[PDB]
Symmetry: none
Subunit: 80 residues, 8 copies
């Protein structure tokens, strides 16, 4: 079931985004996602796109997302 | 209530407020700023600054609270940190 | 007025903010937030895609004269 | 309290300024001007050569507890 | 005239004023700052800030003009751009 | 060997502040020399020929020559 | 060839802002990729294998491969 | 004859300074001089040290200075 305050990158089409790298720093790991006119530092547990796309993993140049669609889980990836 | 037609509009008034994200707050010796990611950069925005195309005046940073003027009435909006 | 075009001529002037002025032992510069950084711009430098020559920096304002041939003054002002 | 010493432990704490605070989606950091840059310092980080542990950031002040063994609280305050 | 013994001294009060250089001025949306090279960095110093070990209060930026308190009397000093 | 810009600083002035991996490779983010720079395995840091030999788990391993001498820069 | 960090940006996002010569060599100062970086002859800029072949008189000469194609970045 | 408002690096012994490089930018050429606890961008026509040491040239990793001493001109250099 889709649920919460939606994040910024939920207001745009996920197909327009691009994974451009992984950055880790003292606070943990982020995927660098180009979309909506900028590069965002996206964490595991953040959301991308219009279908409740939850970021569940960042590894090996790939973001793993689980969307919720008519409800079914539908994985998606964004890769370098 | 009505738009001030002789104030000189600020840079972030030239873009749709829906393309902006609140990414944090910075406080230094001069006071407190909201960090707004928009128009291809990150801007330091103060209370009393403006965001978006509807005279959205920043009235609080604590979340950014904005009051727009729309066809006139006052219409509050906010931008919240993830 | 209308040379090798300067860096900030490769972007739309409407994407730039005058954010301040800096003066140092070498002179006075306007600080222009544009093309993903802040640039130190002098009188005689150029901004935007229409030959926008900087002709004055003063009182938190940069005065620029574009050519669109007709010259057209505009400014960028500090909030 | 008295691990791999952090970068700002290799300099005299008396050379650092609290210059501000920044909060973002990850938490709150004090901005410490020291060792030729500005660092984003969290509670639990260390400053100076005497095990100065940051124990609080609040109201423009960083609270630090050094060990010199006797513990000695001090602070760094924003102007 | 006498030193204020309960104000919290500023960082640049922990160094000799003779080791500082005025390297420029910066003005932004918040106002005007003198850029002071000292104590291993460059600092943004405002009117009403302090420099040096003698309660040197910055009273003007335009050259930085400072008024120190010394054994009390007021003693003006300046730091000038090259 | 052609010298690198970050060899003109004492290695003690550098902090490892993270890692960036992208289509160009894996870089350590080293804070020093006026900003934050991106350093690869086989690049150098410091004044004693400090070659970067590993970037992994928030640590940069460096081997200097003075005798080979291992050094590291660890993410806080 | 091992790729360089500044190959992950469009070359048009870079400005030549000066030159630094010191004990490590002669570097062009290129403003882009989040700050100002120091680039030597034989380093690369941009997404088309833009090799830096000269740094002189406030100009950086670059040769891209797409056919060799000369580009330059000139100090204002 | 020694003459003007003295510059900052005139209040320190020139023998303590070090030439650490040459930087040119849109405004011209500077020598980077480490002294008095910092690195200064010094121009031709600036002064170094306590004996009216005028910088007369910056070239080839070398700063050429002409001091005035008991009066005689006395050249000095600072080199990488
Ligand atoms: Zn975001
Ligand atoms: Zn009202
Ligand atoms: Zn702005
Ligand atoms: Zn520029
Ligand atoms: Zn740090
Ligand atoms: Zn008085
Ligand atoms: Zn300060
Ligand atoms: Zn070996
Ligand atoms: Zn760099
Ligand atoms: Zn060829
Ligand atoms: Zn100086």
């Amino acid at each position: 079931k889709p649920d919460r305050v939606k994040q910024f990158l939920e207001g745009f089409n996920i197909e327009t985004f691009e994974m451009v790298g992984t950055l880790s720093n003292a606070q943990g790991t982020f995927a660098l996602v180009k979309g909506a006119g900028g590069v965002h530092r996206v964490r595991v547990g953040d959301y991308l796109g219009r279908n409740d796309g939850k970021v569940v993993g960042i590894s090996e140049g790939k973001i793993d997302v689980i969307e919720i669609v008519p409800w079914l889980e539908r994985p998606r990836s964004l890769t370098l």
